[PDB]
Amino acid sequence: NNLRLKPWFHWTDEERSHAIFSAYEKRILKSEDLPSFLRANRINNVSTWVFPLIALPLFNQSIFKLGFAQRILLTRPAIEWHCFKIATVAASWLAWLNFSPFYRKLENEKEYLLDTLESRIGINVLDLNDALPRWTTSQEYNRRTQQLYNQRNGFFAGLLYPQEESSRPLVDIASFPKNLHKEKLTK
Amino acid sequence: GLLLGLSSIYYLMYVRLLPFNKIIFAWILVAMFLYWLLSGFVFFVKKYQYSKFTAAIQRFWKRTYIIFWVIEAGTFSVFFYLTLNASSEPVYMYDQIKI
Amino acid sequence: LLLYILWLEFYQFYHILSFYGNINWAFDYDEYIWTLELDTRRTRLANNYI
Amino acid sequence: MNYSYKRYWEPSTAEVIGLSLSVNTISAALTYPIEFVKVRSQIRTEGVGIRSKNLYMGINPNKVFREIHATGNGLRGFYQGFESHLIGRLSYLFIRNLTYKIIYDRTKPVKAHNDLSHREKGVIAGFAGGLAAFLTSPADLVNTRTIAEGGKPKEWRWGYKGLMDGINKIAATEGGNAALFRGSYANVLRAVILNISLTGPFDYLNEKIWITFGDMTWNKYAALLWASFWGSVATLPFDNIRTRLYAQNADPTKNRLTYSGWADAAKKLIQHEGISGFYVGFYAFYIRTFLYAWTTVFITDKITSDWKRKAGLKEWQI
Amino acid sequence: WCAYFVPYNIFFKTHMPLEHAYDNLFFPYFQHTHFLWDNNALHIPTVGG
Amino acid sequence: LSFVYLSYRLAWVLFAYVLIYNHFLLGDIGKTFNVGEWDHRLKPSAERDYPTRYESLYILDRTQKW
Amino acid sequence: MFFELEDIKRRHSLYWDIYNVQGWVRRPDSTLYNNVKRGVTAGVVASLVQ
Amino acid sequence: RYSRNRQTYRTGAYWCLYVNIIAVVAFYFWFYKFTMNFGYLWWLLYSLILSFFFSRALKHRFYNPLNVMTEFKNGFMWFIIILINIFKPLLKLLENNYINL
Amino acid sequence: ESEDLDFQCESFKSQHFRKKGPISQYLILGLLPILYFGTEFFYNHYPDEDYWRVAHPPP
Amino acid sequence: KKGTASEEELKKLYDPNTFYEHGDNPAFKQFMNIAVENLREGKLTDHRTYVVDTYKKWMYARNWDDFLQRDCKAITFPRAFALWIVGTLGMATASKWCRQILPVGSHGITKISQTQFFHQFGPLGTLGAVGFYGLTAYLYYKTTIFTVKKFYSHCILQEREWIFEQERQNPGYGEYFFKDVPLSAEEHFNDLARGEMAKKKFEKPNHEF
Amino acid sequence: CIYQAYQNPLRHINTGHNPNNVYEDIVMLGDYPVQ
Amino acid sequence: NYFYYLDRIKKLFTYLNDLRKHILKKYVYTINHKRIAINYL
Amino acid sequence: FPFLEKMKYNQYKEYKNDYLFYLDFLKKEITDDHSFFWKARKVIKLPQYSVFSFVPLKLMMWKTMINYPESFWYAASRVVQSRRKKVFVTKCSARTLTTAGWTFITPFSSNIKYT
Ligand SMILES: CCCCCCCCCCCCCCCCCC(=O)OC[C@H](COP(=O)([O-])OCC(O)COP(=O)([O-])OC[C@@H](COC(=O)CCCCCCCCCCCCCCCCC)OC(=O)CCCCCCCCCCCCCCCCC)OC(=O)CCCCCCCCCCCCCCCCC
Ligand SMILES: CCCCCCCCCCCCCCCCCC(=O)OC[C@H](COP(=O)([O-])OCC(O)COP(=O)([O-])OC[C@@H](COC(=O)CCCCCCCCCCCCCCCCC)OC(=O)CCCCCCCCCCCCCCCCC)OC(=O)CCCCCCCCCCCCCCCCC
Ligand SMILES: CCCCCCCCCCCCCCCCCC(=O)OC[C@H](COP(=O)([O-])OCC[N+](C)(C)C)OC(=O)CCCCCCCCCCCCCCCCC
Ligand SMILES: CCCCCCCCCCCCCCCCCC(=O)OC[C@H](COP(=O)([O-])OCC[N+](C)(C)C)OC(=O)CCCCCCCCCCCCCCCCC
Ligand SMILES: CCCCCCCCCCCCCCCCCC(=O)OC[C@H](COP(=O)([O-])OCC[N+](C)(C)C)OC(=O)CCCCCCCCCCCCCCCCC
Ligand SMILES: CCCCCCCCCCCCCCCCCC(=O)OC[C@H](COP(=O)([O-])OCC[N+](C)(C)C)OC(=O)CCCCCCCCCCCCCCCCC
Ligand SMILES: CCCCCCCCCCCCCCCCCC(=O)OC[C@H](COP(=O)([O-])OCC[N+](C)(C)C)OC(=O)CCCCCCCCCCCCCCCCC
Ligand SMILES: CCCCCCCCCCCCCCCCCC(=O)OC[C@H](COP(=O)([O-])OCC[N+](C)(C)C)OC(=O)CCCCCCCCCCCCCCCCC
Ligand SMILES: CCCCCCCCCCCCCCCCCC(=O)OC[C@H](COP(=O)([O-])OCC[N+](C)(C)C)OC(=O)CCCCCCCCCCCCCCCCC
Ligand SMILES: CCCCCCCCCCCCCCCCCC(=O)OC[C@H](COP(=O)([O-])OCC[N+](C)(C)C)OC(=O)CCCCCCCCCCCCCCCCC
What we know:
This is part of a larger assembly, with 13 protein chains of eleven kinds.
Chain G: H1 32-49
Chain H: H1 10-32, E1 34-36, H2 42-60, H3 65-87, H4 89-100
Chain L: H1 4-28, H2 33-40
The complex binds cardiolipin (CDL) (2 copies) and 1,2-diacyl-SN-glycero-3-phosphocholine (8 copies).
One 1,2-diacyl-SN-glycero-3-phosphocholine (PC1) binds next to helix 4 and helix 7 of chain D.
Protein name (chain B): Ymf68
Transmembrane segments (chain B): 1-12, 24-45, 66-87
Organism (chain B): Tetrahymena thermophila
């Protein structure tokens, strides 16, 4: 299925994370499929927040000792030297954010989870997406998924938070009453 | 005032979930219309406080006021005549309770 | 006082304009369900003119 | 429109070369006097520019023609340098057509009803025209100098009496063969602009008028008018700069306004005359280009239709 | 209390008009509805301003 | 001045759009104009009630209110 | 291909209208030979008398 | 008798332009449901977008690439200077922590 | 703008006289009916794309 | 070796040149392979998302890239570059205004406290100016990366919005309905292609949950 | 107001009324006359 | 000077901007009855 | 029009607010969820295939539709060569899309049933 377009081929990282969280909270996805995704998300966050700290000493040892770096350091104000260092560090950090192997692994794990959801609920996986609120990011959705996992697997899974097992009544949708009418408004 | 106005506007938008782009375009047009309608009057008020408000200007403004009210009264009177002469079904068999 | 009169005028105007939307509840016995229905209005033309 | 072409028959390289050479020969023979008048008007307006107002803004091609004819040389005076002009035009056409046909054959689409986009066709045509103009620049230089001799003062004239004589004089007197490529860059730019600003508007208007009025016969000629007008509008400044560079005499004292290059000539033109100065003799240039294109298209279409009918193509394919 | 609380409850929290709304009118009795009038939402700027 | 300039630029551009579209671009109404609307929330959501430029990416619906 | 300007030939599809008349249809008699002959005859006859 | 009157009404001209725009757009949307596709003639929309910045750019002569480049360099230096000044006193706080101890 | 008093000077030379200018736009003015009708019918293809086309019977 | 008439027709359908056109999407070179996978059972998948409006989002633009691609209608490299020029001018103006309001690094000033703006407003004003500059810089970076991506996709890879290209090719009432090209019209589309496209079927869900 | 300064900024409060490239406000951004 | 042509172009730009302002003032923002009547015609 | 149709997804609206039976709803059988199927427009007799695709050619590929910010009207806009040049052939489906002249004669002018 290399040439087959998956249902979420156009979804962003935020949309994919929101879909995963929605499936988990609605219990379409069980808690036994999360741990790999959670570990990948934590590793990605650690790498993203630690990259500049490891990179700047490397730039000091290798790049900032280059000919052009020494020229800038010795021939321009210290403020301009600091600006150049900050600019190069920021560019490297952006490149890392874009092409991190850890980020790629996290995206691959999200793809695997989405494939599992597609197999489980057919094409209805598209129903898990909505108009995500602005400024809510994939990291935030992953944090929410981790929080829900902790709440469900913690000591307060039935005292302070809802349990993971579903106790929905067993009825027939084709005959059970519905809360909404197709066209009119009910009383 | 800003708190109350913004809260009321947002609540009234939310209760009916209006289309944002179309409604904001319409409200921008309305805002420009009202702002430029009132800007002329603000300019007149600011300009006539010194060396501009003469007897001719005062008479002109009185005449404009009375003319505007007369123009509105014309349409109101046309509608009042229509109300007074409002048509109805024949009184014999179609509508006997009109009496 | 002008704000009070404005509120009264707006309330009356809203009632008058909402008259023309005739909304009623109809009870479907087969489904045992009340449904909201909208319909036009018929009245004396003097009321519309006023 | 990407599949509206009908390239069901394509001429061979020899046929293309021969037909193009003959048709361009007769077209140049017919339309040479207009180019002569345009060049003379540009030379006489160089350094001064248009100074009339409103309807009189410009130089009258009829006035220039009458002044040239009054010299007593008759119509033979308008064909001075025609040998050089024809040789240069033939060399340019040969090189450009060969390069364009080779590239088009190499990169043509497989389907007969599909043709290269106008962008790619313009790129290829511009490259071929620039190469040909660079190769055959000296002939144009000699022809333009011969034309401008009459306008310029006798002491400033070069006195060439043939293409070979002019080439030899330029090579010897000015020193080195490098002097034969004066104005080559301007000629290349003019050729590129002319190649790219002709085939686009023609197809544009031809298709639009076909859509409007359906399949008629005047559509081709209306599109030709539109394309010729827009090509003149796009190309005339470069032709004027090329003419100025060619007319620039070797000795700085001889030149009324010496130039060091294309940019220098453009700056001097802008300084000494408004931006409109690039469009002196626009009517003559438009008439020349339109007549040349019309005769070439007519003859080529007739011959190609005859060849297609002999081959056996259907009426709609032709 | 007068301009925001009471109008809000009388307009949105009930479809039943008050007496003074229609005592002078001659229409038959009917209820209100906030979601079947002024589709252009021209009342939002008015109330806000 | 910011408000004044915004208003003037918007007015000029919209007026130019109106004139050009009503005088030259009436041949292909489908290509020149987009169809949209929004109805009262009491009635079911209209088919044309959607965010323009995103109809290929989202479908909008709402719950009726009394 | 033959020179700087290219006369691009394009094919089109069938189109027809309700009415096939009152437009432009070339008469069979409208030809170079026949039109020229008639014009020359008329012009010469008129010019001789004039 | 009448005092001097202004000889131009720019706000009035623009108010009339807005009135025309409102009339046309509102009527088409309400009764035809048609909204002009501004993207068809994308260059007028881009003209509006450009005019939203063109005068301010012209004031400082930002049509010159050299001016733009030097302005970007100066702005980046200003931003970095502000950040460094804000975050510098952390070192002094750490140093005086020793005195406090 | 904010440097000149709003007044009319005594000198009559301040009168705004009309002086004829470029004449090119008047060519388009004279050709306007042709241009306007062409835009109305040919450019907008009104009432349809076949009315103005040369008539051909169906195959 | 060559098969029967049916096999020859299938080979022609799978031929790269049977559907591809010079001015059309290159994907038509393997459209049949793509169609067989994306049109299983003859059904077109609806990739749209069903959204119940709740005012959680207004502009509906997921990100600045989507805003430029859809709201600004910049679907071509020239439009992207024009928007980039506008953004560059805006960023330069924003930086100049920030430097003017806070004369830090100019006139020899080396401290924020040496500014009348800080005197009048102080740390909150400095924070506001910093936030404004950062916001404009962020938007400039987003539009620049969008323009670079558009340039790479179009100028280098020759990728284009093929629906827009078809719109350009057909200016309206054009008679380009040719039987030779199946894609020109619905009628001219090959009958066997319709059957071949719906050859495969979907897979039933597991319902494992 | 392009390459030619006609109005006097010393007698104006804001120079942004008309497009130009040769005018600068006397009271620039960040300047606050305070007693 | 090395930018005489550039100076001429700057003069042209100034002339065009001044003409734009003059046209806007005299035919768009004007309240003159004769000009309004001509535009009406 | 089917893209504009909203009743197709009306079933999901109830579960967007009532999650209690959302899993049971998902456990149903998928027939036409998030899919469009156009009935045959031409008579085809091919025993080899039991189903045929009649999706619009312009709507065939989503890879170009996803990033195109336009409505799905290009697919329906003048994509068929078939035409009927007859006067009796109606050009407007709605016979009430007319005008009552400049006199505004009622009830023709003032009733939507006619104008
Ligand atoms: C303010 C402006 C704003 C924008 C608007 C612009 C308006 C412009 C006009 C008004 C203003 C004034 C001008 C300003 C120009 C500014 C730019 C500039 O620098 O251009 C100068 C530039 C050059 O002008 P120049 O400096 O005067 O020099 C030209 C001279 O004429 C050269 O002299 P020549 O003609 O006598 O040439 C002799 C010839 C002598 O010949 C030689 O080259 C000698 C050495 C090689 C010899 C061998 C040749 C090959 C044969 C042998 C091969 C090997 C053997 C093979 C086997 C054996 C058989 C052969 O030399 C050449 O070939 C050319 C010179 C370079 C030679 C050195 C080597 C080059 C190598 C690379 C090229 C190689 C290929 C060349 C040929 C083409 C391909 C076929 O001209 C232009 O760029 C033209 C104008 C601009 C065009 C682009 C459009 C820009 C505007 C776009 C629209 C904008 C609208 C919106 C507004 C934007 C506002 C910003
Ligand atoms: C020892 C044990 C320690 C244990 C640990 C705990 C204890 C230790 C201390 C813990 C401290 C925790 C601190 C938490 C806050 C900070 C971190 C945080 O939350 O980050 C936000 C953010 C949260 O995102 P996320 O949830 O992780 O999602 C990431 C996902 O991968 C995908 O997400 P995405 O990337 O798509 O989304 C990006 C962004 C979406 O983009 C945006 O929305 C950003 C829009 C532009 C904002 C511009 C703000 C101005 C400052 C910019 C940054 C500094 C200047 C950079 C200059 C660069 C050029 C040199 O999303 C957001 O973050 C949305 C936030 C929106 C709220 C903004 C708040 C207001 C800002 C304005 C304030 C001033 C005005 C208002 C004042 C009001 C006062 C009442 O973190 C990041 O992901 C950022 C990653 C790194 C990017 C670096 C980019 C280049 C700049 C850095 C290099 C140059 C530095 C130069 C200065 C150096 C000296 C200072
Ligand atoms: C209690 C003692 C501590 C100090 C108290 C301080 C007094 C506070 C007074 C608040 C006045 C609020 C004015 C609101 C105006 C808008 C009203 C409106 O829109 O109507 C909504 C509502 C009415 O909504 P409604 O639609 O239900 O109207 C009911 C209509 N009738 C009466 C026929 C049944 O307003 C009211 O309920 C009353 C409004 C009265 C407005 C009177 C205006 C002039 C006088 C103002 C009070 C002056 C008091 C001065 C201090 C005296 C101290 C002794
Ligand atoms: C073997 C015996 C059997 C008969 C053999 C044939 C007899 C000899 C025929 C000689 C050639 C005759 C035609 C010459 C050209 C036209 C007449 C003439 O004098 O022109 C010379 C004119 C010159 O005229 P001129 O004006 O310079 O004459 C001298 C002028 N004064 C007295 C002031 C000095 O042209 C040239 O000689 C130069 C250009 C020639 C090449 C370009 C020709 C372009 C036009 C070609 C198309 C047809 C033109 C004719 C159209 C009208 C007739 C159909
Ligand atoms: C600030 C100033 C900066 C100046 C320098 C940097 C910027 C340079 C910008 C250059 C722009 C070039 C644009 C080319 C013209 C495209 C116009 C266009 O799209 O028109 C629509 C049409 C598009 O046609 P189409 O193929 O899409 O189809 C048209 C038909 N319909 C509408 C139905 C689809 O393109 C043309 O007609 C272009 C024809 C000309 C193409 C060739 C251009 C010149 C190429 C030169 C190559 C090199 C020559 C040798 C050089 C030797 C020395 C190095
Ligand atoms: C149907 C609609 C679509 C139409 C498409 C078809 C083409 C449309 C073409 C429209 C443009 C027409 C231009 C006409 C040109 C003039 C013709 C004429 O005869 O007039 C000559 C006159 C004078 O030309 P002249 O200067 O050469 O005069 C010569 C003077 N003597 C004789 C003394 C030597 O031209 C002008 O006065 C100027 C004309 C151009 C005006 C340009 C206006 C826009 C400028 C924008 C600049 C933006 C700069 C931004 C960068 C930053 C700046 C600080
Ligand atoms: C507007 C946005 C663009 C950027 C900002 C503006 C900068 C550019 C401003 C240019 C203004 C116009 C300059 C030329 C003025 C010519 C005036 C004139 O007619 O002079 C009398 C000349 C006189 O020519 P004549 O010598 O043949 O005279 C014939 C008339 N009698 C016989 C009476 C003397 O008339 C013409 O040539 C008429 C046609 C003029 C066409 C001018 C086209 C200018 C195009 C320049 C750019 C190149 C084309 C690009 C677009 C098309 C191709 C893609
Ligand atoms: C305009 C003034 C100056 C000029 C004077 C002359 C103008 C004369 C205009 C009328 C001429 C005659 C024609 C009459 C047409 C009537 C049309 C009509 O009824 O439309 C009404 C329309 C309703 O039309 P509709 O079409 O929606 O009607 C619904 C009916 N059905 C369902 C059948 C379609 O309403 C509006 O236009 C909205 C008005 C909103 C007013 C909001 C007032 C707010 C007051 C706030 C203060 C009070 C206290 C609360 C404060 C709270 C603060 C938080
Ligand atoms: C009298 C003609 C000259 C007028 C000069 C002054 C006005 C400016 C020019 C206006 C346009 C002139 C007509 C030709 C171009 C029409 C382009 C167009 O949009 O038509 C498409 C239209 C239909 O195009 P379409 O229907 O395919 O699509 C148009 C665009 N959309 C998709 C938005 C609808 O075609 C026509 O109306 C047919 C026009 C036939 C004209 C034949 C005579 C003129 C041809 C020779 C001209 C030679 C000189 C050069 C032109 C004048 C000087 C610059
Ligand atoms: C009648 C009213 C008329 C109103 C007209 C205005 C309508 C709205 C126009 C919006 C245009 C801007 C782009 C819209 C599309 C956004 C797309 C997007 O994702 O965002 C792009 C960008 C963000 O880039 P992004 O695209 O990377 O962000 C999305 C990506 N994730 C999910 C990872 C975050 O945001 C913006 O364009 C807007 C940023 C904020 C602008 C603020 C301006 C004013 C300054 C602050 C004032 C003080 C506020 C105080 C708040 C206090 C809170 C407690």
